[PDB]
């Protein structure tokens, strides 16, 4: 593993390095503005199984590809309506994700076996500049062990895979924090499939409004056309409890329930915006997007620790906010408390 640090004046020659790896066929964690990923060459089969045994990812959930021109998009898809070719000028480089009938250019291992590809143009020069020189495609799901809480941070995917992986940019830490927007083109009106770092009410105002998929309230999927539907995620090895309602109501049962589980003898964290005593806490911030950039990085503190529950304070669904809720219901198995 070679951890390669650069900073935002980008030296080329060790982003070449990276490259290389990547046209070798090897595995590559890069940052994005969204969360850190796992990339392989999307034109080689044997690459992108790589990615699934590492991570230990079931081979029915796909991989979003990554590029850095739109003339990549006409080469990884066919048939693409107007409608996402306009969603792309308007979107890309950022947090949108399309999925799109495939060509036969891509392999059906990235696609978890579909007609469909997921496809993004990451907002970040170091994923950006490592997709140009690499001179390919490049297929990543979050740099994390299946399961686990997102990476927003090198740190982070080195904890999970330093001595697994051939490579890690350090970017960073990541400045949205949560996934990308995933939304289905192959139908209209788009389907959100799983909420992200472009925010609903974004795409709604150009597009007007959208269906939304039963996944993201929690139905649980036999196919997925894009990650983060299928099977479980987000999720430290604590329990998570996530307590919903008005601001003050919710701090209030947080105080009942960190006394309730100490007298049961366990180690509780919390993470909030509240002040609090209890054996580990940590502060998500006051704004949503502050939330949001620490969420993951809050997740993956309280799992480096004994806590055995851990107790979110819910935001309301605006903005980030619904991708916020998505990862936090999930990673708590919907273990939800509304005060109201
Ligand atoms: C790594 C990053 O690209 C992630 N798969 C996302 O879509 O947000």
């Not at 990615?51 to 590809?65: H, M, Q, S, T, Y």
């Not at 740190?155 to 289905?184: L, M, N, P, Q, W």
């Not at 999720?235 to 329930?257: H, N």
Request: net charge negative.
């Amino acid at each position: 593993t070679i951890i390669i640090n650069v900073r935002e004046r980008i030296e080329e020659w060790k982003i070449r390095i990276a490259a290389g790896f990547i046209r070798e066929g090897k595995l590559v964690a890069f940052p994005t503005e969204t969360v850190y990923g796992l990339g392989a060459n999307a034109l080689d089969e044997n690459a992108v199984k790589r990615i699934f045994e590492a991570k230990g990812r079931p081979a029915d959930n796909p991989l979003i590809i990554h590029i850095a021109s739109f003339e990549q998009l006409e080469v990884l898809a066919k048939e693409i309506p107007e409608e996402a070719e306009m969603l792309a000028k308007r979107f890309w480089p950022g947090p949108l994700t399309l999925v799109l009938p495939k060509s036969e250019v891509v392999p059906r291992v990235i696609t978890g076996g579909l007609d469909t590809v997921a496809v993004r143009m990451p907002a970040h020069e170091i994923a950006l500049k490592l997709i140009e020189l690499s001179e390919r495609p490049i297929a990543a799901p979050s740099a994390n062990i299946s399961g686990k809480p997102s990476p927003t941070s090198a740190h982070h995917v080195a904890e999970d895979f330093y001595g697994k992986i051939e490579c890690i940019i350090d970017g960073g830490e990541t400045r949205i924090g949560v996934e990308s927007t995933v939304i289905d083109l192959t139908e209209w009106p788009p389907v959100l499939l799983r909420p992200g770092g472009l925010p609903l009410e974004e795409i709604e105002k150009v597009i007007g409004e959208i269906r939304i998929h039963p996944a993201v309230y929690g139905k649980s999927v036999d196919t997925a056309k894009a990650p983060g539907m299928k099977y479980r995620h987000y999720a430290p090895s604590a329990e998570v409890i996530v307590v919903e309602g008005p601001r003050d109501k919710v701090r209030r049962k947080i105080e009942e329930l960190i006394a309730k589980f100490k007298e049961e003898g366990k180690k509780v964290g919390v993470i909030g915006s509240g002040s609090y005593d209890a054996d580990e806490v940590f502060y998500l911030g006051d704004t949503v997007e502050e939330i949001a950039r620490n969420l993951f990085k809050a997740l993956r503190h309280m799992d480096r620790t004994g806590v055995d529950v851990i107790l979110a304070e819910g935001v309301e669904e605006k903005g980030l906010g619904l991708a916020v809720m998505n990862r936090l219901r999930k990673a708590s198995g919907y273990r939800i408390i509304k005060v109201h």
